[PDB]
């Protein structure tokens, strides 16, 4: 019962560490823009259980991993320039 379908994740990438580098950067952008970034939003969003129950799972890392295996996301080695990829990100409620 380890990580949400972790074997299916390695398969997407050419080298182990790619999965690691992406899952990072996606959580990194996910973190900044108060989760208003999600590609899975609806009822797919990951959750917790408490003395209340069903509150959004705070861990950004978790989110990236579930977000990644819906295929929706696109990662690349060099397409899209960073200096213009930073500004355009503030489109639907930023930091």
């Amino acid at each position: 019962m380890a990580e949400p379908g972790i074997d299916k994740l390695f398969g997407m990438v050419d080298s182990k560490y790619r999965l690691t580098v992406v899952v990072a950067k996606r959580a990194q952008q996910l973190l900044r823009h108060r989760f208003k970034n999600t590609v899975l939003e609806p009822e797919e969003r990951p959750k917790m259980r408490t003395l209340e129950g069903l509150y959004d799972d705070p861990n950004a890392v978790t989110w990236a991993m579930k977000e990644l295996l819906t295929g929706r996301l696109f990662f690349g080695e060099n397409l899209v320039p960073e200096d213009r990829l930073q500004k355009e990100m503030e489109r639907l409620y930023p930091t």
Binding site: K16, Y17, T20, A27, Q28, L31, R32, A60
Partner: protein, 1114 residues
């Protein structure tokens, strides 16, 4: 509870007094109570007589002699406790009475002179050195004599070793080189031997007579016709070569030393030096290597017949043989007394040098004694030793056995005798010859294994410091009542019989007799025999000797158990074990940790703090009981009374118990009911399961005391002051401090709470204007004083037991310069067991508590009683500590049969005997069952059936008798408390002695997030509010590298240590809830660039395409 003894072989002699090595040596090096006429060499007298007829520069010409007459030890200035309280060396003034003589005669017999202060021993065996107890541990080194050995550097050759008593002469080595030359080595200088012979009148012919024969070895002694000429001219060229710079004919000056006179070379007075060389070399000898002053020439004594023997050993006579540098016939002990006297000898030889200088200076008719003597050399030399030498330990005080062990400790390392921890392997090995002298078990585990060791039980150190064992004498057939302590040397001559050997009354019982001779085991005729063993105990150390079924313990696990016992923390309800080896009475007693009556009388005053007793006449003594003191190790040793107000006394029976003592029987832990089975992975690997029922019974609970200290100094900015008016502080804070700044007796003290208040001045700038305008206007006026108090370290604390204060000038109190007043606060704790405590039994079964189970769970016997510890079986057969099993079975008998036992080592309980006891015990345990109207319930059967199918029970027999069998076998039907059912297949259950050890989870374990980083290194350490950070070692770095852990590694080297900028960016970020930093340029990079620049060396950064990039700009 009643006592059942076991095994035959009765001990012809009781054990020696144990603290012998320690106590009985010093005494005879100190000759404290013997008329100063009788006092007869070695010890203080020696060192005195060694140096003393001190002639002046130009001997007997310029007047002034000065000589020793007698010495007086004083009366110690302070009480034994006074010394510990006020940090003092428990000392005595040693004055020496000396007379000075003139050329015109003076009888100036100056009324004693202070020569310095001498530390002296407790009754116990230990010393007190600036407060704090200490142990002078006894060292082993090669015994003075002549030796040989084969050349390890030169295959098929031999060196020749000459060894005098240590710090009394140098090492001399003869070694025939692969180039003809023979060469004497000495003072780490190497010269052709001939020279030294030429001085002893050896002509080039008398060499061809005494030293040709065996080979043409003299070839390299002879071709040096260069100097085989004049004795005096030899003397010079040697002097020239040895200690250079000054080459006239008064070489006789130096050469007299390593020749005649007890100046340096006194290998022996009537000791081994001769004896050894008179037995291992070529007979006939006196005192020093070569006799100098005869009638002006230097006459030979040792040098030639050595060179002879060496030569007659590279081809040589059969019977000429290499030496065993490992035999205990060449290994001596240096006792305390010997090492102290050796240091006392250094003092004098320094005072003398001083005296020699002053007689020359002053006018020869004014100078008296007292006017010549320094009194600072000896004072310092004796001081240096007891305080600073590696052979001067703290004091293993954990329990009363520990201390004892610490005294009979034998080291190989340290000063003079200098084995580095980076040497030896055969020097580690247990030598045949340790038998009876040194324990073949009970060594330390790692790194020291072999170099630190304990004294065998019955063994004892002799006049010249070889260990001797007792052996019974056998007049062919009869086994005498006469015992003989003999050398390891005087032992390789006889057919010694084991004590195992049977005897009808007082004579041998079988024709095939087991015995050792020259080591190797031999079976022998009852006539052939020459001696016997006194007891198997003889062979092992004390702690070893504390192990009930040692028989069935594998040696390796037995050492762990032999140790650990040392680690046993004294418990509140200490209790001697259900199964003993007998030895437990005496170990308590000789430790003097417990009180005992003086001369059979009657008790009179019996309360918590005192026992006083009306003796038979003898007057009246009150004995005070030390109560809740503190060990060297935080152990908390205290005495409890064990006698009734008004009763006749046992000439010396227990008056009061020690700390690990129950009724004068060594009680190092508790006995408890155990199951031997796995639980649910809860006793996985080595973990142990506890019945919380233990805690309830205040069982494994121990008292520990910590001590805290705080000083007060003056400095440029003023004095540090132990005030109670600490600034910036509530009354809540000071609630507990007396009008002084010290906590009250009996305060519950938490972490952070003020223990001792005190105020440094500190002048961190001068308060700027404007901020005084407000400081005045609003009231709160500026202050000249900082908080700097004590306060309880995070996690510590408990109840405040005692305070203590030494201020400057107090009676006998001297404390380090520029400091005045020292405060000490003692806090106490009551502990109980916990998840992560270490428990071990004497068989070497260690392990940590992993789970305290509520009584509902826990395997329980049908009658209702649950067990107390669940010990996993898988930890049994891997190690071969089978005794632990054996010990549990008897403990099952004992439990129901309600008794204690005494099964000594290699002579205790035998299976049938235990089984019989078990049979006897079961008729009771089931006697009860059936008497209270019960028997064999459906569960028990379910088991029994499948039990015979296993093959443990007899098919055909009735369920009752089936139960008996299974019981007797040490096993029994057990019930799972969790589900009313049984565990199919019976479980072995019984009583087992287990100890709670030194180490507790309480003292281990910290957590840090952020706290005081150092102003030196700039990484986390120092913990003024919380603890300090874990370290990331080189091996952890490799692992992170070996992973793909880029950042996780980088993080550990920047934002978590010295990288202030990003270190802070980290903290800020999280406070906010931002994804930590991204430390773009690591500080440690910038710091590198620069330290280099401050040395010149450009050091310049470059990007991919290769143009300077710049990493600064700040």
């Amino acid at each position: 509870m009643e006592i059942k003894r076991f095994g035959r072989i009765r001990e012809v002699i009781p054990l020696p007094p144990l603290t012998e090595i320690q106590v009985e040596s010093y005494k005879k090096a100190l000759q404290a109570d013997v008329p100063p006429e009788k006092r007869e060499n070695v010890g203080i007298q020696a060192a005195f007589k060694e140096t003393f007829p001190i002639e002046e520069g130009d001997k007997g010409k310029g007047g002034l002699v000065l000589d020793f007459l007698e010495y007086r030890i004083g009366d110690p200035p302070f009480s034994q406790d006074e010394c510990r309280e006020k940090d003092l060396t428990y000392q005595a003034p040693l004055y020496a009475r000396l007379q000075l003589i003139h050329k015109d005669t003076g009888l100036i017999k100056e009324d004693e002179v202070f020569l310095g202060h001498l530390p002296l021993m407790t009754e116990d065996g230990s010393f007190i050195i600036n407060g704090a107890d200490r142990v002078i541990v006894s060292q082993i080194h090669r015994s003075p004599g002549v030796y040989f050995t084969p050349d390890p550097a030169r295959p098929g050759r031999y060196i020749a070793s000459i060894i005098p008593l240590p710090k009394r002469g140098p090492w001399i080595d003869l070694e025939v080189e692969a180039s003809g030359v023979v060469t004497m080595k000495v003072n780490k200088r190497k010269f052709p031997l001939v020279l030294l012979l030429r001085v002893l009148g050896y002509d080039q012919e008398t060499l061809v007579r005494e030293l040709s024969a065996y080979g043409d070895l003299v070839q390299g002694l002879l071709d040096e016709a260069v100097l085989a000429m004049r004795p005096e001219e030899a003397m010079v060229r040697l002097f020239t070569l040895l200690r250079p710079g000054d080459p006239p004919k008064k070489d006789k000056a130096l050469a007299y030393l390593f020749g005649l006179l007890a100046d340096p070379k006194r290998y022996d007075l009537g000791e081994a030096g001769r004896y050894k060389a008179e037995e291992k070399l070529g007979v006939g000898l006196s005192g020093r290597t070569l006799v100098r002053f005869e009638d002006g020439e230097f006459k030979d004594e040792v040098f030639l017949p050595t060179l002879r023997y060496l030569f007659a050993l590279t081809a040589g006579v059969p019977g000429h043989e290499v030496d065993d540098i490992d035999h205990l016939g060449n290994r001596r002990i240096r006792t305390v007394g010997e090492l102290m006297a050796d240091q006392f000898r250094v003092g004098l030889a320094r005072l003398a040098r001083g005296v020699r200088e002053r007689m020359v200076m002053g006018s020869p008719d004014t100078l008296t004694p007292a006017k010549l003597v320094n009194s600072r050399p000896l004072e310092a030399a004796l001081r240096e030793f007891f305080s600073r030498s590696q052979l001067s330990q703290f004091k293993d005080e954990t329990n009363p056995l520990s201390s004892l062990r610490h005294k009979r400790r034998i080291s190989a390392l340290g000063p003079g005798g200098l084995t580095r921890e980076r040497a030896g392997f055969d020097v580690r090995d247990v030598h045949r010859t340790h038998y009876g002298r040194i324990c073949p078990v009970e060594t330390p585990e790692g790194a020291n294994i072999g170099l630190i060791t304990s004294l065998a039980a019955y063994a004892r150190v002799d006049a010249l410091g070889f260990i001797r064992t007792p052996y019974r004498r056998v007049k062919n057939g009869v086994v005498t009542e006469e015992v003989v302590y003999m050398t390891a040397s005087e032992e390789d001559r006889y057919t010694i019989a084991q004590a195992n050997t049977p005897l009808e009354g007082d004579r041998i019982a079988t024709d095939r007799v087991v015995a050792r001779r020259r080591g190797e085991p031999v079976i022998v005729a009852p006539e052939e025999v020459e001696f016997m063993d006194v007891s198997p105990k003889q062979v092992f150390s004390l702690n070893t000797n504390l192990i009930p079924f040692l028989e069935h313990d594998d040696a390796n696990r037995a050492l762990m158990g032999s140790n650990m016992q040392t680690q046993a923390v004294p418990l509140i309800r200490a209790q001697a074990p259900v199964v003993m080896t007998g030895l437990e009475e005496r170990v308590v007693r000789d430790s003097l940790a417990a009180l005992y009556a003086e001369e059979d009388g009657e008790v009179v005053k019996v309360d918590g703090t005192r026992i006083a007793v009306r003796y038979e006449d003898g007057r009246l003594v009150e004995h005070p009981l030390r109560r809740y003191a503190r060990s060297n190790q935080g152990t908390a040793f205290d005495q409890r009374p064990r006698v009734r107000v008004g009763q006749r006394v046992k000439k010396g029976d227990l008056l009061a118990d020690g700390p690990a003592s129950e009724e004068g029987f060594l009680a190092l832990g508790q006995n408890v009911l155990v199951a031997i089975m796995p639980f649910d992975g809860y006793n996985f690997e080595d973990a142990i399961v506890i019945s919380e029922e233990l805690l309830k019974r205040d069982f494994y609970t121990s008292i520990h005391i910590e001590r805290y200290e705080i000083e007060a100094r003056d400095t440029k900015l003023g004095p540090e002051r132990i005030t109670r008016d600490i600034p910036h502080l509530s009354e809540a804070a000071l609630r507990d401090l007396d009008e002084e700044g010290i906590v009250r007796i009996g305060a519950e003290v938490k972490p952070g709470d003020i223990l001792v208040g005190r105020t440094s001045f500190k002048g961190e700038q001068e308060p700027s204007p404007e901020e005084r305008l407000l400081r005045s206007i609003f009231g709160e006026k500026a202050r000249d004083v900082k908080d700097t108090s004590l306060r309880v370290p995070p996690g510590e604390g408990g109840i405040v037991v005692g305070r203590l204060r030494l201020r400057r000038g107090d009676p006998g109190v001297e404390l380090k310069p520029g400091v005045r007043e020292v405060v000490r606060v003692f806090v106490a704790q009551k502990r109980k067991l916990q998840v992560g405590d270490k428990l071990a039994n004497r068989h070497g079964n260690k392990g940590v508590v992993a789970k305290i189970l509520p009584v509902e769970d826990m395997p329980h016997l049908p009658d209702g009683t649950p067990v107390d510890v669940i010990l996993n079986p898988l930890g049994v057969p891997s190690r071969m500590n089978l005794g632990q099993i054996l010990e549990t079975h008897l403990g099952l008998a004992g439990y129901f049969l309600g008794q204690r036992y005494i099964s000594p080592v290699f002579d205790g309980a035998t299976e049938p005997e235990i089984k019989e006891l078990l049979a006897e015990a079961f008729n009771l345990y089931f006697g009860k069952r059936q008497g209270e109207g019960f028997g064999v319930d459906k569960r028990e059967k379910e088991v029994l059936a499948r039990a015979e199918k296993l093959g443990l029970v007899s098919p055909g027999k009735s369920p009752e008798e089936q139960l008996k069998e299974l019981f007797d076998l040490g096993k029994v039907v057990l019930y799972d408390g969790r589900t009313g059912e049984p565990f199919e297949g019976p479980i072995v259950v019984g009583q087992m002695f287990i100890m709670k050890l030194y180490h507790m989870v309480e003292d281990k374990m910290h957590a840090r997030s952020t706290g005081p980083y150092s102003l030196i290194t700039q990484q986390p350490l120092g913990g003024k509010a919380q603890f300090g950070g874990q370290r990331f070692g080189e091996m952890e770095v490799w692992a992170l590298e070996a992973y793909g852990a880029a950042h996780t590694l980088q993080e550990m080297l920047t934002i978590k240590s010295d990288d202030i900028e990003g270190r802070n960016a980290a903290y800020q970020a999280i406070i906010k809830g931002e994804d930590v930093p991204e430390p773009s340029v690591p500080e440690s990079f910038r710091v590198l660039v620069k330290e280099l620049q401050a040395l010149a060396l450009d050091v310049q950064t470059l990007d991919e395409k290769d143009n300077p990039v710049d990493i600064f700009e700040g």
